[PDB]
Amino acid sequence: RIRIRLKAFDHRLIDQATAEIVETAKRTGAQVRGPIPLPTRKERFTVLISPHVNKDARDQYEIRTHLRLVDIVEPTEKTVDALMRLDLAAGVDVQISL
Amino acid sequence: PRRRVIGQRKILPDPKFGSELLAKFVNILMVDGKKSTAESIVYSALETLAQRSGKSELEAFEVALENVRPTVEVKSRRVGGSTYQVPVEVRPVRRNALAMRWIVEAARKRGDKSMALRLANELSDAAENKGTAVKKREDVHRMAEANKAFA
Amino acid sequence: ARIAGINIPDHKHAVIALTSIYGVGKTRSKAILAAAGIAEDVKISELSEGQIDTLRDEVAKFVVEGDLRREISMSIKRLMDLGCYRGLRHRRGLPVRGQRTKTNARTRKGPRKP
Amino acid sequence: NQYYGTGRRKSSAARVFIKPGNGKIVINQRSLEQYFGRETARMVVRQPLELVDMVEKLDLYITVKGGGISGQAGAIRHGITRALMEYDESLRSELRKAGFVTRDARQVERKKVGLRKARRRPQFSKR
Amino acid sequence: AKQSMKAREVKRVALADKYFAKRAELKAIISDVNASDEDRWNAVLKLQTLPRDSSPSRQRNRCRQTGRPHGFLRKFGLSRIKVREAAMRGEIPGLKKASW
Amino acid sequence: PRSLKKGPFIDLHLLKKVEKAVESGDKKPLRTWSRRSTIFPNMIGLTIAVHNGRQHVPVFVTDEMVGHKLGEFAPTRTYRGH
Amino acid sequence: GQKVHPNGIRLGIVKPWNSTWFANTKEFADNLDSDFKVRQYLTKELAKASVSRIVIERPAKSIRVTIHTARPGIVIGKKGEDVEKLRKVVADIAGVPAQINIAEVRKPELDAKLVADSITSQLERRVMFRRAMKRAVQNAMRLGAKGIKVEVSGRLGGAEIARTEWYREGRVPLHTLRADIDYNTSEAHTTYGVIGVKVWIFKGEI
RNA sequence: CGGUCCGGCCGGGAACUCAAAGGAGACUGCCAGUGAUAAACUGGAGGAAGGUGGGGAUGACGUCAAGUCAUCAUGGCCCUUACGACCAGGGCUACACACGUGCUACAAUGGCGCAUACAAAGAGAAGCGACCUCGCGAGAGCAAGCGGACCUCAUAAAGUGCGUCGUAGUCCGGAUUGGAGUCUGCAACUCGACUCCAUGAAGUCGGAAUCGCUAGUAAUCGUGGAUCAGAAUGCCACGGUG
Ligand SMILES: [Mg+2]
């Protein structure tokens, strides 16, 4: 019914946010199927460390794209309202598929 | 290695018979990593030898190897300008391997139409002591014999 | 046996025999075989003259051997006196298709001189 | 009774489900000669069974994901061993001696930076 | 790169912004099989006449901070070196000096 | 190489010039920077000075020229010998 | 010249992220550039007032920027109109309406960036460089820094050859990843050339 | 387990690979000998893991006035109706050569034809593009789905199962040179690939010399990606044999 996806670059922070979301769900609404971590989209970015020459030198970087899905197959009027405004995501991109 | 002396990795026996030596031979034959082709070739070679000799496939393999393996092997010492190629007692572990390698080389050299057939022929030659690997072994021994003088 | 200008070694398989003739190759050979109704497995040995004739006709239908060479040679000649990039390359003995002439142009050039 | 066995080799993940009696070998809804091509691989898969005196005594329903051919076979073998361990957990002495309980630390070493392969340096002129 | 270079691409970008739909429609009809031949011809010459700077082909994407076209990145929009510099300062979210 | 469905290259200016020449009946050397143009049946008889980099070289248009571009006939690179 | 940039190896370990926002690949680069521009603007504006670094966070397309400063008396000013004005320009730069938060750094000499800035200033108004460096280190020690390494490079005192000069006091564990190494660089635009002031300050072990 | 299109497909089942959060867990801790009674060493057991378990990031003092003042910033010196800028094309792809570095080769462990097996890791809404249709085919139309473990790009290829050819310059290798077409983009002529037809150069393991690699390593087969309208034998990575 309602699929809420949580997207952040830091893992601990994402976990925290997920927990917060779960808490929000539990109080106001019903059911909730908790946190399910989806495979980390690892953005392998290789950068030449030197501006001029030096092929052997490469700085190897990675963006950890963390995905968290909390699944609820039950809509309540109280909780749908207190989720769009009551979330406190801070640095997490929350996508609520209604 | 300058420092490390380690016990070597375990190699599993041959599927058809149950031989480590056979597996080693197959490995020696194989390059690029194509083991299953090499293994098949080896099997084919064994079959033809059995068809010819009328003996056990492994036993025949063994006596051929025996016929091509040396007891003494030369090794360079490089102390002076002149060659100090000292002969040394070869361990039974690596001797076998060397023989196998020689056999493989001989097979490679040979000009029969199937590679399996080539190596079968090589085996046959070894059994009757007349092939290329055996010849190589002979002169190696001769070389050692000549310079067995050194210690 | 003569199929389109030049002679063919009788030992060979169908697909390969046709290839020996200038202008026709493997796919061409296959096509010819399909047109005929015969498979590639049969050699020049074990073939009736009638069967051969059809094959020959089919080969003729395609621009083959001498005529094709003439067409190509004539085209080359035309290019030459036109004097385009294609033409001067031909005149010089240098790559046309888009190769590095600096290094590895050795097919059109041949062996190294100095 | 049903028993589970997990299998790993290089990149492969294998499941092994063991049930006593009848004696069946099933790999992804197929037989061993049906599913696997190489004889060596088959032998290796049979290898843990081979040591012990069990032929028709247990059925094996197995599913394998990832890996290769020989690697896959190895993973399967590992899974089987795990299952066997789960079944008894007293005949480990033989297995350890054999070298079957250990999952390969021999694994995909990553392609390196500035180097042509995993350990291979690019062929270079000294001067 | 040079300031001039930066200016050039800015101009090109602006042109692209202006001309795209007009460009797009022409492309569409060029593609179309069910279309008049004379009309197609007309479209093609229009395209030929219409600016080269308006084309996304002339759009050589540069560093949005400095101006370097070489070592561009669609994630960050910057020079490789510049990205690294940013990253180390902590100025990029996600990008870790990581291992796998 | 382009698709025949898409349509081979013609520059407008040069086409116009060609048309003028045809109407005019003057022919003679005609200046050309844009080397991408395909040779047309109306262009046969006209001499066209194609830009090769430093200089314009006049190449006479023939019937053996239809499926070609002008800049191919322009020796855009120059070489004598080592 | 060789080593890792310490702030970039510790960004997911001990150092909190300077950039704290999520954006899609479609909308990442531009956002980053905007952030950079804002940073630049801040640098331009509050160089005379003592600033160190800023942390950027944008939830629900409404940015909150955290500013790490030494003295709030000049940074905020006497009234919150200047702050509002500043916000406006940030908003203009970015797109969406802008909000900011200010943070006063406790122990200004514990933070490296401020110290570096001070050093740069000293260099500019012509003081003995070595002596200044020494003074800085002493101050840091007084303040309770467990370790401090400073490093200046090149064209020192108008010499025809570059001068690499560095002072090290206490313990500066650059290799310990669980160490709180606060590292910053300020590059002096002097009359004789460019002097690069590098500074690591070891705060604590966690 | 019940139920059936014999599809995980499903009423269901949350058991387990999986997934990634929090951890346990490997420490010379355990047994012995050696050894100054110590550090420690050489073994042994248990144990998934062994003496740093593997790999990576990690580069102290500093060297070479090492590289870059064309990422950036810079002290200055100079051009300042020109050493400045805008456009158009040419080029940077030249070509008697000399070298370096990658790739395909010389064959039957093979080449190809015809059946068939195993993935891993990626990348995507001015995007990927099932299904159906037409094209030898690259690709088109047609029309769903997926901000994407769901939709896709992509069938992994070696391997296996048959068939052949019978060591030839070969059914090796595919170069080059031409022809017929398809996308991409304002536009492939210098100057993109690719679909195809032909064509069949050198080369039958390479002189002196030299180079990499200690185990999932080399060797070797494929699969991605990043810069890309467009274009990798490079590079970064993922996996198969081994
Ligand atoms: Mg050479």
Side-chain angles (χ1 to χ4, degrees), chain A residues 76-96:
Chain A
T76 322
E77 208 165 302
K78 197 155 87 275
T79 190
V80 68
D81 193 63
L83 197 81
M84 290 173 182
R85 54 187 183 98
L86 277 89
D87 54 296
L88 208 81
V92 188
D93 190 67
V94 313
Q95 285 197 113
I96 311 103

Side-chain angles (χ1 to χ4, degrees), chain G residues 10-157:
Chain G
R10 297 161 206 257
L11 51 77
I13 318 297
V14 284
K15 283 275 177 182
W17 261 342
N18 259 66
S19 203
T20 43
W21 47 267
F22 198 96
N24 231 298
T25 321
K26 195 209 285 177
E27 57 205 59
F28 199 63
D30 294 297
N31 282 31
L32 165 67
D33 196 77
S34 80
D35 290 319
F36 186 80
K37 201 169 169 185
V38 308
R39 283 160 183 287
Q40 202 179 115
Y41 169 71
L42 213 138
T43 317
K44 187 198 169 185
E45 191 73 59
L46 308 98
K48 224 157 200 74
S50 288
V51 84
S52 56
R53 77 172 219 268
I54 65 148
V55 177
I56 308 159
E57 184 189 72
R58 55 221 245 171
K61 282 196 273 179
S62 185
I63 326 151
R64 356 207 174 71
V65 150
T66 318
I67 307 149
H68 298 83
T69 180
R71 30 194 145 94
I74 328 150
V75 149
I76 308 156
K78 286 180 181 180
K79 217 165 187 177
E81 287 182 61
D82 295 65
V83 172
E84 190 185 63
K85 183 193 171 182
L86 213 147
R87 284 143 84 263
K88 295 288 104 180
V89 247
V90 174
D92 274 55
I93 293 155
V96 288
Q99 197 184 55
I100 63 103
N101 297 111
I102 46 97
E104 191 202 61
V105 111
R106 288 168 187 177
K107 290 181 180 181
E109 285 125 304
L110 197 81
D111 196 272
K113 187 70 190 175
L114 302 156
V115 175
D117 185 61
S118 78
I119 291 156
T120 307
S121 187
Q122 283 171 105
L123 283 150
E124 292 283 70
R125 63 183 185 264
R126 323 191 147 68
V127 324
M128 276 285 283
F129 51 93
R130 201 197 260 273
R131 282 188 177 294
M133 251 158 90
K134 208 165 90 75
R135 224 173 307 274
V137 169
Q138 282 171 249
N139 243 309
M141 287 260 293
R142 286 196 198 73
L143 266 293
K146 316 277 178 182
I148 172 155
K149 191 184 174 175
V150 313
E151 187 193 299
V152 298
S153 192
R155 263 279 190 195
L156 273 172

Side-chain angles (χ1 to χ4, degrees), chain A residues 39-92:
Chain A
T40 317
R41 186 66 81 70
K42 297 182 172 183
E43 313 274 77
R44 278 89 152 86
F45 294 125
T46 327
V47 166
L48 279 95
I49 345 175
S50 191
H52 195 268
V53 290
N54 302 297
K55 53 149 176 183
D56 202 286
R58 263 114 184 181
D59 254 20
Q60 299 196 256
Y61 284 68
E62 187 194 292
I63 286 164
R64 276 115 146 104
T65 316
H66 305 289
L67 297 311
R68 295 285 192 276
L69 174 121
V70 145
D71 208 292
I72 317 151
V73 207
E74 198 180 299
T76 322
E77 208 165 302
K78 197 155 87 275
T79 190
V80 68
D81 193 63
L83 197 81
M84 290 173 182
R85 54 187 183 98
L86 277 89
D87 54 296
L88 208 81
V92 188

Side-chain angles (χ1 to χ4, degrees), chain D residues 74-91:
Chain D
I76 281 153
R77 154 190 143 163
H78 186 242
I80 288 160
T81 59
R82 249 88 195 274
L84 202 79
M85 300 178 218
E86 287 221 338
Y87 173 77
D88 203 33
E89 219 161 61
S90 62
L91 294 159

Side-chain angles (χ1 to χ4, degrees), chain D residues 53-103:
Chain D
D53 198 64
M54 278 176 273
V55 181
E56 213 181 62
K57 224 157 192 176
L58 46 80
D59 293 314
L60 63 101
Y61 176 79
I62 71 156
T63 47
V64 69
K65 284 178 86 181
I69 294 301
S70 93
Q72 224 185 16
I76 281 153
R77 154 190 143 163
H78 186 242
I80 288 160
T81 59
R82 249 88 195 274
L84 202 79
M85 300 178 218
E86 287 221 338
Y87 173 77
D88 203 33
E89 219 161 61
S90 62
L91 294 159
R92 295 290 295 293
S93 186
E94 203 172 64
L95 211 66
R96 304 186 150 291
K97 191 190 173 183
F100 273 56
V101 353
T102 314
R103 176 264 187 284

Side-chain angles (χ1 to χ4, degrees), chain G residues 2-4 24 26 149 161 166 175 189 191-192 194:
Chain G
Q2 70 237 34
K3 70 176 81 185
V4 76
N24 231 298
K26 195 209 285 177
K149 191 184 174 175
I161 38 159
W166 61 279
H175 250 91
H189 291 93
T191 321
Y192 311 106
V194 192

Side-chain angles (χ1 to χ4, degrees), chain B:
Chain B
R2 179 80 67 178
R3 194 167 211 154
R4 290 171 183 177
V5 179
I6 51 150
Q8 61 181 110
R9 59 190 78 84
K10 193 172 180 169
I11 305 146
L12 283 308
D14 191 65
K16 204 177 182 179
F17 301 96
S19 187
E20 259 94 309
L21 207 71
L22 219 153
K24 213 157 278 177
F25 184 70
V26 309
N27 291 7
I28 285 151
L29 186 74
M30 172 211 80
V31 75
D32 321 283
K34 293 171 184 177
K35 198 173 84 182
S36 189
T37 51
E39 152 217 314
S40 188
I41 273 179
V42 166
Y43 280 142
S44 184
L46 258 71
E47 201 68 59
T48 321
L49 197 67
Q51 202 169 301
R52 275 180 306 247
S53 60
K55 289 176 182 179
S56 187
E57 284 179 62
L58 204 145
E59 292 286 299
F61 174 76
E62 207 276 299
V63 288
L65 201 76
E66 186 199 61
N67 221 319
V68 310
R69 61 182 168 179
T71 49
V72 208
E73 188 208 24
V74 282
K75 171 256 181 179
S76 191
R77 199 71 80 93
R78 293 172 186 175
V79 173
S82 188
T83 317
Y84 290 166
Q85 209 177 181
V86 295
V88 76
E89 292 88 287
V90 68
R91 5 261 70 268
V93 186
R94 92 178 225 96
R95 178 193 286 173
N96 272 343
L98 228 167
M100 287 183 257
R101 110 203 317 162
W102 277 342
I103 289 156
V104 149
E105 206 167 299
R108 257 88 178 261
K109 285 177 179 182
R110 208 80 171 268
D112 199 287
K113 309 242 167 74
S114 186
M115 188 66 188
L117 263 69
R118 286 186 187 115
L119 199 134
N121 278 114
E122 215 293 308
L123 281 137
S124 187
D125 283 309
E128 288 172 62
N129 52 260
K130 55 185 177 180
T132 318
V134 71
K135 187 196 167 287
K136 199 178 179 184
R137 158 222 186 297
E138 280 184 62
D139 187 42
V140 160
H141 196 250
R142 253 82 68 67
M143 202 164 280
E145 273 183 296
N147 295 110
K148 207 176 275 179
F150 300 92

